[PDB]
Amino acid sequence: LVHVASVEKGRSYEDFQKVYNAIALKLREDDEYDNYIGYGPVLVRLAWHISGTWDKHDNTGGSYGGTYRFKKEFNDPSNAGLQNGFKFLEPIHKEFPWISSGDLFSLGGVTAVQEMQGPKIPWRCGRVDTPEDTTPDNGRLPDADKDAGYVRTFFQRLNMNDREVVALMGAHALGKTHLKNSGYEGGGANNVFTNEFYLNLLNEDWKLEKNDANNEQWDSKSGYMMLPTDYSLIQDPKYLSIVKEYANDQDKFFKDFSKAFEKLLENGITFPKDAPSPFIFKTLEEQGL
Numbered sequence: 001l002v003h004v005a006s007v008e009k010g011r012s013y014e015d016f017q018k019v020y021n022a023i024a025l026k027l028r029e030d031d032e033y034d035n036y037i038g039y040g041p042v043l044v045r046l047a048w049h050i051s052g053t054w055d056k057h058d059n060t061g062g063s064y065g066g067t068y069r070f071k072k073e074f075n076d077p078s079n080a081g082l083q084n085g086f087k088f089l090e091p092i093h094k095e096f097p098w099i100s101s102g103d104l105f106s107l108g109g110v111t112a113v114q115e116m117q118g119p120k121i122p123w124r125c126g127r128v129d130t131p132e133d134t135t136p137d138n139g140r141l142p143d144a145d146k147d148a149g150y151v152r153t154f155f156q157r158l159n160m161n162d163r164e165v166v167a168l169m170g171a172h173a174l175g176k177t178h179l180k181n182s183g184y185e186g187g188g189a190n191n192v193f194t195n196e197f198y199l200n201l202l203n204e205d206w207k208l209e210k211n212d213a214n215n216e217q218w219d220s221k222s223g224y225m226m227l228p229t230d231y232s233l234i235q236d237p238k239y240l241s242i243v244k245e246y247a248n249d250q251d252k253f254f255k256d257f258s259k260a261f262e263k264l265l266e267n268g269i270t271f272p273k274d275a276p277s278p279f280i281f282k283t284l285e286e287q288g289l
């Protein structure tokens with residue numbers, strides 16, 4: 001199964017920078033969402049969940065086909081809450097109806113990371129919408145109640161190694177868990193992209209508690225929250241070494257996250273030899289906007 005990137009007809013860097021800007025201006029405008037976290041975190045989660053259905057063995061799933069727009073996939077229990085991200089992106093899609101759905105969902109994640117002061121994430125266009133029967137079945141996204149060996153095995157399906165897993169998990173600095181979406185609650189209100197997930201794992205006094213949905217989670221007196229899968233990164237000695245590395249080197253963590261996140265959003269896609277180079281979008285702040 002081969003998915004060849006096909007550039008929206010006649011479009012170039014400037015067209016996609018205009019879409020980036022419209023998403024970034026809306027992120028700034030719609031600041032009240034989720035008790036003033038804003039939409040950045042949910043857009044990052046959306047871009048990960050539309051990409052994380054990929055299976056390297058048969059190239060099913062993945063961001064290319066924009067299949068989250070179909071009911072089977074937007075109703076996946078693992079996607080509960082992401083409808084907020086989709087509704088945020090709807091006026092963007094209306095303004096720029098030429099962008100494919102996979103390009104819009106993945107660019108929403110890139111734009112959110114950068115506007116939250118994260119690394120620059122190179123991004124490539126050319127995902128093409130595919131039909132409803134290409135939508136992957138539910139059940140391909142990971143469970144959060146599991147241990148390190150589950151996480152390691154899970155990510156092998158996405159062709160990610162230990163460093164790529166630990167880097168990608170640093171996005172759990174952002175936003176929060178919501179009991180009604182996932183059965184986990186808490187985590188505060190953070191909307192600045194930093195390496196604080198790793199510092200919190202190493203420095204907080206974690207207690208294993210049960211939440212109001214009767215699921216276990218790790219909580220600190222300070223109000224920080226880790227899922228069992230997050231905590232597994234300090235239980236397994238190979239992950240722990242990488243958590244310490246990122247806790248001690250902000251720049252290394254940004255560069256490794258950028259590479260892993262781009263790879264995640266590009267899994268499954270064949271880029272022709274003469275495809276454009278990846279775009280690196282300017283932030284609103286860099287543009288004086």
Ligand code: HEM
Pocket residue numbers: 041042044045048080081142143144145151168169171172174175176177178179181182183184227229261
């Ligand atoms: C073992 C892998 C993972 C598990 C089990 C997991 C699980 C979860 C759960 C249960 C939530 C809370 C959802 C809610 O209640 O709203 C969440 C939130 C979130 N996740 Fe993950 N995740 C994993 C990996 C990732 C990755 C790879 C990324 C992106 C690079 C990511 C980005 C996020 C973001 C940004 C949030 C906050 C969303 C919000 O504030 O609305 N997750 N994750």
Ligand SMILES: c1cnc2cc[nH]c2c1
Pocket residue numbers: 171172173174175176177186187188225226227230
């Ligand atoms: C997943 C797990 N923990 C937290 C804390 C903030 N956002 C999170 C996402």
